[PDB]
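Reproducibility note. Readers wishing to regenerate the assembly model reported in the main text can use the exact inputs given here. Chain order matters: entities are listed in the order in which they were concatenated for prediction.
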Amino acid sequence: MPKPIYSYSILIFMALKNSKTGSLPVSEIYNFMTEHFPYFKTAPDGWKNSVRHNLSLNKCFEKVENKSKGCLWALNPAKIDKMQEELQK
DNA sequence: GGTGGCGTCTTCA
DNA sequence: TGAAGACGCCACC
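Running the prediction on these inputs yields the following structure tokens for the assembly.
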């Protein structure tokens, strides 16, 4: 169908804020996106790469220390207001 | 061949 | 300057 109106940053923010602990491995970010935005179930390859590009670059998201193979990703708490504002559009 | 972290390159404002 | 994202690389298993 159409792409979501949301940037990848906001899509990731939705996935993480919706989670039980507030952090997810990227495989579960993908599952959130395909479950909530069925566009991604059939989207051309590459979108996963873009999600991970955003996670690494954006200081909005922080890589969490593995507790006891993918890392967990979490929100930068100082950037939640900004992400919340952008979501309200 | 898939996965995940991060990089390159272009477009645009 | 830099947001934004399409697309690439490569260590690792």
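We highlight two features of this model. Helices of chain A lie at 8-17, 26-36, 39-42, 47-57, 80-87. The domain at 1-89 of chain A is CATH 1.10.10.10 (Arc Repressor Mutant, subunit A).
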